[PDB]
């Protein structure tokens, strides 16, 4: 019975492994940034076209000053707010590590010591997946500044554009 | 005894798994900018009028 | 290559399609990263059922 | 248990990195707050709506 418990396959492995997850980042770089047009990266490219659509300013010049400035103060803000959160939740899991340490003591059975190992696995593929989070927020943090400066650079051609033709009239 | 000791469920694991560490960071980030005037991420969104509150000359 | 105005027209092009990209690419990038959290939590679940000790290695 | 023992180490040395990105996160937070201060008093040296001008007497 016993060697039967120790040797053999028990299935674990190919256990959720059809999760796709390689999907949702590109499969190849070379053509990341001509995904809006077509081809390239397909999941970005629709959400590429919505953002295209609706990052374009609207309404008179004064309403897109303050939208513009409106952004630049709410983003410094957000990423301040995000990071202390993100902060508060980093000291709590230092504090569920500190715990499962304290667990490792009282262990008395291997069985018992080998389902803590893979515990505090887990628990680091958690921080793992946090710090691809923080990766991810700070790529945003990025291109909403970038944005913020396309939207500053739109409202600057506007009003310096060529094509205008008005002037004021001597009445 | 000793198999006793090498097969069998222990528990560990469901072990401090109720602790929701994933709520301090943003659940989706369509909205993540949105979340001063409401919605978007709530727990943000109280310190972000503080913060823009605080930073008034 | 060509006009000094296709060339103005294709670096606005550029500009802005990096930085929607830029944006497009972290969004997808963040529900993947927490439909891979779900996964974790997942395997840790089953974590709790494990018998033998091939099981659990 | 040495190894749980080194695993748990692995996983604080992983909180100290996302602590670490957090802070510079915080760090240019800061940096865009400043920028916004000094924009924020340049609008009200130059603010149009300013009514006053020095008198002759």
């Keep these: 019975r016993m060697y039967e418990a120790v ?3 028990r299935g674990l492995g190919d256990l959720m492994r059809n999760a796709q997850l ?9 053509t990341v940034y001509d995904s809006a047009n077509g081809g390239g990266y397909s999941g970005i490219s629709g959400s590429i076209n919505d953002i295209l659509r609706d990052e374009r300013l609207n309404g008179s010049v004064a309403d ?9 103060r709410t983003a410094a803000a957000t990423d301040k707010a ?9 000291q709590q899991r230092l504090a569920q590590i500190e715990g499962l340490m304290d667990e490792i003591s009282r262990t008395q059975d291997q069985k018992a010591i080998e389902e803590l190992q893979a515990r505090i696995a887990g628990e680091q593929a958690a921080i793992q997946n946090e710090t691809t989070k ?9 291109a909403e500044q970038a944005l913020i400066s396309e939207q500053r650079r739109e409202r600057n051609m506007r009003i310096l554009s060529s094509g205008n ?3 004021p009239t001597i009445q």
């Design 7 to 9: 040797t053999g396959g």
């Design 22 to 30: 390689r999907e949702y980042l590109p499969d190849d770089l070379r």
């Design 64 to 72: 897109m000053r303050r939208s513009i400035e409106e952004r630049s």
């Design 82 to 90: 995000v990071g202390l959160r993100a902060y508060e939740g980093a």
């Design 134 to 142: 923080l990766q991810m927020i700070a790529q945003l943090r990025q």
């Design 165 to 167: 033709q008005g002037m």
